[PDB]
Write a structure and sequence with these properties.
Order of helices and strands of chain A: EHEEEE
Order of helices and strands of chain G: EEEEHEHH
Organism of A: Giardia lamblia ATCC 50803
Shape of chain G: elongated
Distance between the termini of chain A: 10 Å
Helix content of chain G: 10-25%
Entry title: Cryo-EM structure of small subunit of Giardia lamblia ribosome at 2.9 A resolution
Chain A: Ribosomal protein S20
Shape of chain A: elongated
Chains: A mainly beta (about 70), B mainly alpha (about 60), C alpha+beta (about 180), D alpha+beta (about 50), E alpha+beta (about 130), F alpha+beta (about 80), G alpha+beta (about 120)
PDB class: ribosome
Number of helices of chain A: 1
Keywords: ribosome, giardia, parasite
Largest sheet of chain G: 5 strands, mixed
Oligomer: part of a larger assembly
Strand content of chain G: 15-25%
Largest interface: A-C, 15 and 12 residues
Bound molecules: potassium ion, magnesium ion
Number of domains of chain A: 1
Chain lengths: ~70, ~60, ~180, ~50, ~130, ~80, ~120
RNA sequence: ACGGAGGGGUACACCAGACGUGGAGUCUGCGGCUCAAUCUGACCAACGCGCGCACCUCACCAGGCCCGCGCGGUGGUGCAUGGCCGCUCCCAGCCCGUGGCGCGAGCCGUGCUCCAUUGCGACAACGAGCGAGACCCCGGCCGCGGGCCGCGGGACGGCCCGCAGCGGGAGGACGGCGGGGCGAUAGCAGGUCUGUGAUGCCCUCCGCCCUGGGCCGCACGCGCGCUACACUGGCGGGGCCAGCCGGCGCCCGCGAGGACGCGAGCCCCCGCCGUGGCCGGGACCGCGGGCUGGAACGCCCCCGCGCACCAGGAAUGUCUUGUAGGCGCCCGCCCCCACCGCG
């Protein structure tokens, strides 16, 4: 059979593509997190930035071009 | 401890003055009434809409008495 | 692990954007996207040079295809405007208000410019020229506000300049405050 | 003449600046904490 | 059946029955051994090998379908290691005692090998059920 | 002036009417991925070429970006004998 | 075919009911034994067959989630009649927690202290 | 601006309490002392801070290559500068056009309430804007769709009594939603040139590399912590439950750990010890057996050795619901290694 993996970091575009592929015919969200001090040096009150990159994936099982999405068949 | 800002009030007054006939003094009907775009009202959020409708319902039962 | 591919694409996109900035400063590089590279310029008529010679020679530094749009409203984009200000270094007040006049001509609700560095008599100071309405808080700051910043390598020490534009009535969403009735 | 760099060691540096100190290797970023603050916009990380 | 009876009854009533019929009966290394690296002394009740093996077979019975393994049994009998001036941490138990037990339990046809790990064979499953 | 065949290998990765261009990682394997010569040998010639003007360079993320200019390909045509 | 839920901090008890096993172990033998009267309250304050699978949380939270699943499943066989709306009021008039879940949850830790509200000791010399 | 001036508000700042710290040993940072060097920054808003020093890092010492065996340059100057951060301050504050007052510096705009310059209402001022709020993320309850994720509904001071709003009841998953993100005008000779190909001006040609050493050296005084002083406890055996997401099978070995292959602790129950620095407490030291690595001085395991400590002076800090406290688990820097920080 055939498999389509689709991966993307912006939920809106991913949903648009996922919607308009159903016009032609477990994978949960995992979050890349980095916490880093806000200052370039280490002087002052110790405050921290919390940065987060959330990705999304869908797996279509089978028998529109958007810049930012990733698709692999395997 | 919930004081309505001028933004709620100023929209609520034009809504009550324009649509006096439509608004009963009971709240669900006004919740619908702060939704239509024919009684044109561009509310860009539903919490905002609920607060405006909560003040509109109160404006209704003050003109009767 | 299918995400270790997308992360490297994400990092390579930043590599490419940084190189376009530092090199195509000459044509006013603004932004780029990956998919096949889309570069967003003010004038394509130089990025695609004569006979495309300069363009394709770029397409071989990527191996060690592209196509280009055009920026339609120049004054509303804050990143080629800081470059325009960079070029003129001209009295500071005149250059700042020249930037502001064309930003407002484009139809912006607000715009302002900050300059800081070596102005007079061995003393760092800061000048703030401004016109219209601006915002600085909440979520909408990331949608409707636009900032850009460059350092001018002046004769004396460095001089930093920032340019900010506020355009709320654009093709897109609506500011969660403005509430029209009729 | 043939002794220059015989010592073997990782020389991990930041992909952007070149520093050796405070390099983040999680997820395979390999960039330092000072450069991670300003390049994080386009790499993709955002604050929530 | 096995699931019904108070779990503390079956274990200590089958370990006394582990003295009859020449079942797994204890080897010699039993002396001078701690059941774990977190323990600081050896067990004091001399029937501890009997009760331990009764417990490990009652553990094997509950996982009727799939296979347990030895390293993941020492994890089941884990304890925290104290007296170090640092915060206490958990340690896996000793695999030698458990592997010794399961080896002799693979005899007498009480257990059968699988793809990875031991499994409760129909014989022995019947015995514990009875 | 050290070695000639490497001196011309470094002209292999410049095309005298074609569009290929060179990027360099400034290592300071231990060989440039393009051909197989040591990095130092390419670095010396690139300092020379910049000093004369055979290329224009920018730089970004630890990596030397060069583009062959107008004067440079004329300079090279008499070192590789083309038309 | 009755299907019912019960929730505590992270515990979820899924109940299937047909005209009493907890995770295949008989109810009378739920190991935390000084709290055995709690898992039996709806019975002894108010049979059939029920099957309980509880996961997540801890000992006490699991007990309290089965205390809600059990009492909520014996309210989905009586329907549309005054018993349905009166046994509920009898259950709450003992403990409302018997019908409606407890919303409380762990709060997040904030930087500058070990807990959500406790900070770090301040010194001046 | 300040007042040991008056008036009006307010916050875990106090009240009522809880948990501590300061006393013991010990990890780490600081000062001093020593040293060939023990590289350097900072004194509410410096002192587990500048993301884990055997080499590297590396700025410092003893030697030695290159161009024993311009070009660069973490050189200086943060009181020459950019950018980022901290702080005044998460305070409720700031400010424009036209009119009015004054020679002018300037002024006007700018009582009852709310967390709040949040609003009612009044006014030589009329009319706008920013900050506040709205907004974004998370989590509670219910629907349509897919196979739990992703699209919506839901709460509004809406109902009922008593007097813009303060009270008391009710239903409901939640009652005035809750925890976070963002963050105005004006500034401070805080911090950072040692994070960069940011950088002016000074000075070096102090660049790059290799071997070995130091940053960890110790009469002593301080900051943040860790572990205790026991019976509401220590020990032996058994039972069983998480979330941030996450490999483990088979043999050797007391253990630590190796050769070979494939897809939770607290707590509960049953015993033991018996008020004795005891079986509390585990620092210091003496043999062994391992792991990392080019290299232990790094870390682990085994037997033995069993310090001080009996609840801590004068002082002193934090905190109101799944909260304090107790218990463990994971990630980061990372050859090895947490008494640390983020969760
Ligand atoms: K600090
Ligand atoms: K967050
Ligand atoms: K600190
Ligand atoms: K007048
Ligand atoms: K005047
Ligand atoms: K006046
Ligand atoms: K007045
Ligand atoms: K005024
Ligand atoms: K006044
Ligand atoms: K007035
Ligand atoms: K879906
Ligand atoms: K989906
Ligand atoms: K409403
Ligand atoms: K800097
Ligand atoms: Mg060293």
């Amino acid at each position: 059979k055939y498999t389509i993996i689709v991966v993307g970091k912006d939920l809106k575009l991913v949903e648009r593509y996922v919607k308009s592929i159903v016009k032609e015919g477990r994978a949960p969200v995992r979050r890349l997190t980095i916490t880093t001090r806000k200052s370039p040096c280490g002087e002052g009150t110790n405050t921290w930035h919390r940065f987060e990159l959330r990705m999304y994936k869908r797996t279509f099982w089978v028998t529109v071009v958007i810049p930012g999405i990733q698709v692999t068949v395997e | 401890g919930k004081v309505r800002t001028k933004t709620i009030k100023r929209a609520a007054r034009k809504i009550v003055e324009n649509n006096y006939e439509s608004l009963k003094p009971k709240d669900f009907q006004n919740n619908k009434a702060i939704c239509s775009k024919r009684n044109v009202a561009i509310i860009p959020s539903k919490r905002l809409r609920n607060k405006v409708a909560g003040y509109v319902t109160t404006l209704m039962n003050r003109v009767v008495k | 692990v299918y995400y270790s591919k997308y992360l490297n694409d994400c990092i390579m996109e930043a590599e490419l954007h940084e190189f376009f900035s530092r090199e195509l400063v000459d044509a006013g590089y603004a932004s780029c996207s990956l998919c096949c590279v889309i570069i967003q310029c003010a004038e394509p008529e130089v990025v695609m040079g004569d006979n495309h010679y300069r363009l394709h020679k770029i397409e071989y530094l990527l191996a060690g295809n592209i196509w280009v749009d055009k920026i339609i409203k120049r004054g509303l984009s804050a990143e080629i405007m800081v470059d325009n200000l960079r070029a003129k270094l001209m009295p500071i007040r005149r250059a700042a208000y020249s930037i502001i006049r064309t930003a407002m001509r484009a139809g912006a609700a607000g715009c302002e410019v900050i300059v800081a560095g070596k102005l007079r008599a061995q003393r760092a100071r800061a000048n703030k020229f401004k016109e219209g309405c601006l915002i600085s808080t909440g979520h909408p700051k990331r949608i409707f506000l636009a900032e850009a910043t460059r350092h001018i390598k002046m004769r004396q020490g460095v001089i930093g300049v920032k340019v900010r534009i506020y355009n709320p009535n654009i093709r897109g969403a609506v500011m969660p405050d403005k509430i029209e009735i009729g | 003449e043939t002794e220059f760099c015989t010592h073997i060691a990782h020389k991990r540096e930041c992909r952007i600046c070149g520093n050796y100190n405070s390099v983040y290797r999680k997820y395979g970023l390999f960039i330092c904490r000072r450069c991670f603050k300003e390049n994080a916009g386009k790499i993709g990380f955002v604050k929530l | 059946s096995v699931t019904r009876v108070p779990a503390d009854v079956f274990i200590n009533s089958f370990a006394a029955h582990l003295k009859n019929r020449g079942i797994i009966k204890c080897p010699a290394f039993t002396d001078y051994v701690k059941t774990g690296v977190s323990r600081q002394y050896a067990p004091r009740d001399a029937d501890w090998f009997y009760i331990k093996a009764a417990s490990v077979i009652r553990h094997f019975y509950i996982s009727g379908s799939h296979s347990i393994g030895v390293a993941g049994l020492a994890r089941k009998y884990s304890s925290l290691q104290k007296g170090k001036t640092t915060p206490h941490h958990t340690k896996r138990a000793s695999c030698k005692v458990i592997r010794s037990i399961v080896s002799q339990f693979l005899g007498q046809k009480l257990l059968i090998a699988g793809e990875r790990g031991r499994h409760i064979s129909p014989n022995g499953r019947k015995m514990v059920e009875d | 002036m050290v070695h000639i065949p490497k001196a011309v290998y470094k002209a292999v990765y410049a095309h005298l009417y074609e569009n290929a261009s060179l990027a360099l990682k400034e290592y300071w394997d231990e060989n440039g991925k393009l051909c197989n010569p040591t990095y130092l040998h390419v670095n010396c010639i690139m300092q020379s070429l910049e000093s004369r003007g055979v290329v224009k360079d920018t730089f970004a993320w630890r990596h030397h970006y060069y583009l062959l200019t107008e004067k440079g390909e004329q300079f090279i045509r008499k070192e590789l004998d083309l038309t | 075919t009755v299907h019912t839920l019960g929730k505590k901090k992270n515990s979820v008890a899924v109940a299937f009911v047909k005209a009493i096993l907890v995770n295949n172990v008989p109810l009378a033998l739920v190991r935390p034994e000084i709290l055995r009267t709690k898992v039996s309250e709806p019975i002894m304050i108010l049979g059939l067959d029920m099957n309980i699978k509880v996961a997540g949380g801890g000992h006490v939270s699991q007990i309290y989630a089965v205390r809600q699943a059990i009492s909520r499943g014996v309210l989905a066989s009586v329907k549309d009649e005054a018993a349905r709306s009166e046994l509920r009021a009898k259950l709450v008039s003992y403990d409302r927690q018997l019908v409606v879940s407890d919303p409380r949850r762990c709060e997040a830790k904030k930087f500058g202290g070990r807990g959500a509200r406790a900070r770090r000791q301040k010194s001046y010399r």
